[PDB]
Homo-oligomer: A and B are copies of this chain.
């Protein structure tokens, strides 16, 4: 997928990497029951702690530029570097959001709640007032500052449907601009999920651990490359994405 890096910006970042990142989170809950008198029927059950590991898989790829074109056009190298970096940053976006990446990178799907929902097409085909009740459910211990993810098409369709004006979203504004749903900002990214927003904010949904990003490496010294000058400029993806629970 190729667009603006919008999900990563709101996505929580963690380093802690020697080779890779390590984080510790809680699971489960301590619950209660009893009555008046002495004695009572009473039972136990404590919380649990997890330590999860997050690996980074490389999504490389090469580009073989000849010495003749490299010497004839000096600009064609800098344009190649400037393009290949965005192309794989968007390849990272595919992993960061929820898509399929042509380069062999991490392939996960939609932002999870406290649960990983199964990817399924909805019988009713509309995104509407369900975005109002979600960060509203996000008001128990649940902290707001959410982000309802919607596709530019549904954002144009939501602009098409009845709002304050005949145009505009929940905030009366054109699509893919300063996007905003009810009581919080909206994220407009193409080719994504068309369903009710997941429970829990940034911290619960998506986390991005980064060692680095796609690094370029050109090697003029390869058995066939050195004589021709047909040097191989190589993008090499780094930094991973995680879709957390609890």
A residues apposed to B, CB below 8 Å: 2-4, 18-20, 24, 26, 29-36, 38-40, 42-49, 55-66, 68-69, 71-73, 75-76, 79-80, 83-84, 86-88, 90-91, 102-105, 129, 132-133, 135-141, 152-153, 156, 159-160, 162-167, 170, 174-177, 182-183, 188, 190, 214, 217, 219, 221-223, 226-228, 232-237
Contacts and interface: CB of A to CB of B under 8 A. Distances in A.
B103 A34 contact: yes
A45 B165 CA distance: 48
A140 B105 CA distance: 21
Nearest to A107: B36
A217 B152 CA distance: 54
A170 B170 contact: no
B24 A47 contact: no
Given A29-B87, A58-B228, A133-B156, A46 B233 contact: yes
6 contacts: A32-B61, A32-B103, A38-B42, A60-B227, A217-B226, A221-B221
B43 A160 contact: no
B174 A136 contact: yes
Contact of A177 (B20, B57, B159, B183): B183
Main secondary structure of the interface of A (DSSP, over half): loop
Given A139-B176, A176-B136, A35 B63 contact: no
Contact of A61 (B2, B34, B90, B133): B34
A55 B66 CA distance: 13
A20 to B, nearest CB: 8
Contacts of A20: 72
